[PDB]
Symmetry: C3
Subunit: 485 residues, 3 copies
């Protein structure tokens, strides 16, 4: 007689994963699906990263004297450091966030000088709070107009848009601290600024009052913006307290954005940028930060998610035995194989078809459901330094909802994939056993432990024929029937 | 002896679907789950669709002379064309989108005239920029008040809400271009308009300055609105630059909305409306547009999603009968599973109705168990913009993108899971039929290894029919079968 | 000979669930996953709940005389009743919702009095619309300044923030009804109020005009707020129509919120609070309300969702029979068992291993994918008493999208879990049958009804050995072979 057994490989060190029906189960191999670390650096390729050392985007746009190196710059991502500061005339911007977001999304600081004509007033006003070297200065992109002689005539100028692109204009209004200062600068006792197009209008009345000292000034300047479509026209009408523009900014559409971070910039290649630094995007999920730019993994709350890439791990108990509650640590060539006890001796081989089928099924399984990468460039703000109320609450609620939903999706997907992997491996083993049983019609009996008891003389050639699939039962039919009964 | 085989049908041309464990597998039949085309026309039933033609909703509400045909109109969906224009006094509306959404959601333009008394001022002002035929005119729902004689007395009027429904009032403020114009129209050198109720107030100070010429006017008019609850009182106080209302609009709660489109309107029936036109809602997902009205399929990014309907398609081997082991039967058209028998009388074929019916019943109605039939949404947020604004527009775009991504992922996962379960159930049905057939023959037959049984006794057509029916009795063949086997 | 059967238990009354491949299937046991009822009361533990009674949060903060009991109060959840009313000077708050949300999220009403100096004006103004007992009064936290003698000097005061926490200041502007009233109260014909810090500024110009009578007054007061960071300074500049503050509120960060409800408050323990009342949080989903505070189940549209707990329910048909299309209602000591017919007599036993395995797999099944509870404290508003436009539409859209997505998730999860439960129970039964068949090598053959017939004499000891797994086929092989052939 002879003995033939079927079994599967095993490893000394397994990994614990989670499935639908099992809290913990050990498998031969697994991979991590969550990226939870960063190098702390921001790669300068392939995106064009612009580093604002001590300047905010708004200050660079306005023309702060210590931000003059940023003139006519372009970027894919603008990085704002926490050590940035303002060193010019004090100012405030109503709807600061909207202007900052639109400027960042434009992605360029291209400025074109236009020939504005201001008759009856003095131009190029300066202050000691904004020093350009040893002399008083001002924002390079703004014009401060004051009285000439002893009069401030009413200003009424126009400028049409004859190009094929939109124009962005930045202008301002001056708020004096005292009535005497207001009358000294502008002869009128109450100024007025009106800027309008064929479809929109804005009018600001300056406010007079004391304010906390900032770099020796108790006055302030408010900043406003206007966009002129092609074929439209811009009209500026003012009675005083006007901070005139010097030109327009060319506004574009693209995939530029802005980020707050303190990480240094190095020479490397990475497609994902986070405030903590660049991270690889070879995993579907990440746990570093919910603020991202480029092709990045989705953010989830979990810090680890193991995906099974192997079969169940079962130790070998201490006469050969099959796969019934028994693994084989001696199999190196494949995942499934045959162990036979013969008159010549004990042998062992491996089956390539079932192993290849299992490997092909397992490989690239996660790519069938989830997308490879998602590219997001400009999004909403997710961190705030001041309390505002309704809009901030809405933004926080939206972000929280998105994070929770994606975390649930990731958990469910991992559990389902692990369960299906275990099921497919078990099914492959059972299919191999059933095929082996079908090959031997009545010359063998099931020993009950994953092994077959062949009742005729089966040499090495016979075992090889069984493994190949060319076993002929009619040859040994009579001998096996005689031996069994 | 005799031979009995079990197998399943196959088709000459199959469809390729995607499962959890397989990226490309061929099945006998599949159906498309994504609607990706439209007729290009908007059906006028069962929803009431109002064509705006060359008028916007705000212009129609205000009373533009060329929009006078829209007085006291009702709609379920208001369609705005891209060729609409304004032909009256130039104006601007602070928070234009909010007022547009409010009017669209109200769903009606019902106007009730009220008896307002304005003492000491002239009424029914007109301009050459708003012509009512050959003569000067103005907005039909607004009253322009100017000085009478040489004085403009302070106006102080009241109007109580004695009804049981809310009132919507539309009023305005005039912005002169020059100080001389302001003094000429109204005696005071600085106007002031105050409209308030018991719980809210609004005050506007007009601005004087030149503006680009629009239809011969360098002045502008601002538009404001106020809502008066039942039992409340409206008080209007002004001393210049007031564009008085003539009445109130009835405001209702319903399922009306507004849509921007250029598609023509035709006579047909459709429950879903998109800017591209109407689309059928028989499929759970669509790819036409993310802007929808009515009972519409959910929007996804995928162009196509095939749901498996039949079994795995296996070609017939060209080579003695064979079973279902890696071989399909091309000659079966009366069922999904059947028997092929080789006998002394001759060969034959049949079909098993029970297993086929069970598989069909399991497959039928499969997607309705998870996905709800259809979702009905009427008024939503705006999803396309023509100007850059900043924070709010970014938030709206982010919300829409998040929703679209989540629904696309859900659709992909659902399709993969359903295909996998369909394949598994079909294979299980085939295996169960084979196991039952084996269980019927206790010791008179043995498995041949290729999905066929070798019966070791003379089994005529009646015996085969008894096997197929399930009334086979092995006792009266047992002796002969055991004698033949050994 | 002897007969051995394998089967599973059944119950007289079952329940219907839904699976992936079945519209309706009856199981032996199921549990409800959706909470759809409440006791109508709000439990006062463990959260600190403050009853607003007939006062609103804004009125309590301002210092309404009938809300004086709320001074220096703390809360985790503030409950606003629909019967609340105002009984002081008429007022309006621009961006009322933002201030309400800010105060609610702060979670305290701690007030610190500061020594402001107002030179040349009279303080502690009062009105008949706000009665402090028999005499005229005003808001306790606000100071009404009017002319002294026949002059109203320009006011210019400062207050620095030398602490290490943020300060919140509440101030106001008075709107007279007539020019004569404006002149009588304040000498100047046009007032002006300017409040600013080193980084922000606000200027309000009062408006004069008649307004509807409210408690005998045709005038109004507009409320504004300002926040001063540590190291900053507050400057107040005005020349009329100023409602001065008396101090600052301590603003904190925490998990406090506000709710609108009419349910009474009783003494009990509950972690979840809804406007309908408190609900238990032992279920993953709830259908009571979409407004929640604390550890609450997720809100879904469905009102019922049944999760399978037992196996399929098959009534027993009317010579023992196995599990093939037949259940056993007489078995109560286990889920799976054996029935044998013997010469000595019939019997019945239960198998504990398979039952324990099935119970362990079923137990804690839902905890493998979904979390126990999610804690949410402060969120967006979800019900509105008036129409506003864009922001309200955005909030409603966000809430609707979240609800729809979570409902879909719940439905799919329930269907998948039910399908897997049915599959695992069937697999357990089939595995037990296969093991029993494997034990009997050649001494028995399946008769097709889930039972085995044994061709040798098998007494109670032999049946017990078969159940235990110690059955030896070699002892009876010869007798069984002789009987079979
Ligand atoms: C309405 O009320 C506000 C607030 O009370 C007033 O604003 C103050 O205005 C005064 C000037 O009028 C300001 O005083 C100035 O402060 C400067 C900054 O002080 C800081 O830095 C110095 C030096 O580093 C420190 O010693 C000091 O502690 C602060 O940390 C000083 O640099 C100025 O000095 C100048 O004047 C002195 C006068 O002796 C000279 O000796 C100096 O050389 C130099 O020329 C000056 O002291 C004060 O800071 C303002 N306060 C605020 C909060 O802004 C308004 O003036 C008031 N309006 C009216 C109309 O009354
Ligand atoms: C502050 O600054 C603004 C901007 O510069 C000034 O606004 C301009 O005002 C003038 C009038 O004061 C406007 O000129 C008028 O333009 C009308 C439209 O012009 C278009 O159409 C004509 C014909 O189709 C074209 O030829 C032309 O190129 C334009 O395409 C004209 O129809 C008007 O014609 C009137 O005057 C002529 C003079 O000969 C008469 O013959 C006519 O019958 C008719 O009465 C007129 O020419 C100009 O368009 C305004 N510009 C803008 C941008 O709005 C403010 O006036 C200024 N304010 C102060 C106080 O100085
Ligand atoms: C601009 O226009 C507005 C609106 O028309 C005017 O506002 C009105 O002003 C008058 C004058 O004060 C107000 O009249 C007062 O109404 C009080 C409330 O009335 C209600 O309550 C009483 C008692 O419950 C009811 O009987 C009554 O029907 C109302 O339901 C009264 O209590 C006042 O009575 C006082 O005056 C009378 C005069 O004889 C005395 O006998 C009384 O004892 C008491 O002293 C008074 O009648 C009216 O309510 C205001 N209406 C609104 C809507 O606000 C502005 O005055 C006007 N501005 C200018 C400059 O003209
Ligand atoms: C455009 C212009 O007029 N620039 C002035 C500037 C303005 O007058 C002022 O800053 C507007 O608020 O003032 C400069 O001087 C400041 C200086 O002025 C004296 O009159 C005053 O006595 C000093 O205390 C001090 O404020 C400035 O450098 O800011 C001069 C500049 O030309
Ligand atoms: C209600 C009223 O007064 N309507 C007037 C209107 C207004 O005076 C004006 O539009 C307010 O801005 O003006 C109308 O004439 C415009 C006409 O006025 C002359 O005085 C001027 O010299 C011309 O150039 C021209 O602007 C108009 O039709 O708009 C007359 C109308 O009665
Ligand atoms: C701070 C102050 O001046 N309080 C007054 C208050 C104000 O004058 C008024 O409310 C501002 O609008 O008015 C009080 O009197 C109300 C009373 O005043 C008479 O002059 C008038 O003729 C009456 O009709 C009536 O309005 C008030 O109690 O509100 C007095 C208070 O001292
Ligand atoms: C990436 O940077 C963020 C900074 O926003 C880190 O998040 C903070 O971590 C600290 C320390 O645990 C917490 O006190 C803060 O509350 C966190 N902030 C937020 C907004 O969550 C994050 O830990 C960093 N991650 C890595 C991997 O470095
Ligand atoms: C339905 O109409 C929309 C119009 O918004 C079409 O979307 C545009 O398609 C063109 C052509 O590919 C693109 O260039 C635009 O960028 C698309 N716009 C947006 C907002 O996506 C859409 O293709 C139409 N669909 C059908 C089936 O006709
Ligand atoms: C819990 O309270 C809410 C209050 O909003 C109830 O919801 C309302 O129920 C009534 C009665 O059917 C409806 O007419 C309203 O339209 C509902 N409002 C909303 C916003 O849905 C809810 O039914 C209560 N639930 C329980 C279990 O008491
Ligand atoms: C485990 O799987 C990973 C990825 O599938 C593979 O790179 C690795 O070699 C595997 N480990 C072993 C021991 O085969
Ligand atoms: C394929 O399925 C669809 C619907 O499921 C059905 O209408 C069609 O007839 C099927 N195809 C065949 C060849 O039966
Ligand atoms: C049904 O299941 C629940 C929870 O698993 C359990 O409490 C209950 O006792 C079960 N019913 C029966 C009859 O065992």
């Amino acid at each position: 007689t002879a003995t033939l057994c079927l079994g599967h490989h095993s490893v000394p060190n397994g990994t614990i994963v989670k499935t639908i029906t099992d809290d913990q189960i050990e498998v031969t191999n697994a991979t991590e699906l969550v990226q939870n670390s960063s190098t702390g650096k921001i790669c300068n390729n392939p995106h064009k990263v612009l580093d604002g050392r001590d300047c905010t985007l708004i200050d660079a746009m306005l023309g702060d004297p210590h931000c003059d190196v940023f003139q006519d710059e372009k970027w894919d991502l603008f990085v704002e450091r926490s050590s940035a500061f303002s060193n010019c005339y004090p100012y405030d911007v109503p709807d600061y966030a909207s202007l900052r977001s639109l400027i960042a999304s434009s992605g360029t600081l291209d400025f074109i000088t236009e020939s504005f004509t201001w008759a009856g007033v003095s131009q190029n006003g300066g202050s000691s709070a904004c020093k350009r070297g040893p002399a008083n200065g001002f924002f390079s992109r703004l014009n401060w107009l004051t009285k000439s002689g002893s009069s401030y005539p009413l200003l009424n100028v126009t400028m049409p848009n004859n190009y094929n692109f939109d124009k962005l204009y930045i202008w301002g209004v001056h708020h004096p601290s005292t009535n005497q200062e207001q009358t000294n600068l502008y002869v009128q006792a109450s100024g007025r600024v009106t800027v309008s197009t064929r479809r929109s209008q804005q009018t600001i009345v300056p406010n007079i009052g004391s304010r906390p000292w900032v770099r020796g000034q108790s006055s302030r300047i408010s900043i406003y913006w206007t966009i002129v479509k092609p074929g439209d026209v811009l009209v500026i009408n003012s009675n005083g307290n006007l901070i005139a523009p010097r030109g327009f900014f060319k506004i574009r559409t693209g995939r530029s954005s802005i980020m707050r971070s303190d990480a240094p910039i190095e020479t490397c290649i990475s497609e994902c940028i986070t405030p903590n630094g660049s991270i690889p995007n070879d995993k579907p999920f990440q746990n570093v930060n919910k603020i991202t730019y480029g092709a990045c993994p989705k953010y989830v709350k979990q810090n680890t998610l193991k995906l099974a890439t192997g079969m169940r791990n079962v130790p070998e108990k201490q006469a050969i035995a099959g796969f019934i509650e028994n693994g084989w640590e001696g199999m190196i060539d494949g995942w499934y194989g045959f162990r036979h006890q013969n008159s010549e001796g004990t042998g062992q081989a491996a089956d390539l078809k079932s192993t290849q089928a299992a490997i092909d099924q397992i490989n690239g399984k996660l790519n069938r459901v989830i997308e490879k990468t998602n590219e997001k460039f400009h999004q909403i703000e997710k961190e705030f330094s001041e309390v505002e109320g309704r809009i901030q609450d809405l933004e926080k609620y939206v972000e929280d909802t998105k994070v929770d939903l994606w975390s649930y999706n990731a958990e469910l997907l991992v559990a389902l994939e692990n369960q299906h992997t275990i099921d497919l491996t078990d099914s492959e083993m059972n299919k191999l056993f059933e095929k082996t049983r079908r090959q031997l019609r009545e010359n063998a009996e099931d020993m009950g432990n994953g092994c077959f008891k062949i009742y005729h003389k089966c040499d090495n050639a016979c075992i090889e024929s069984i493994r190949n699939g060319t076993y002929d039962h009619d040859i040994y039919r009579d001998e096996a029937l005689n031996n069994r009964f």
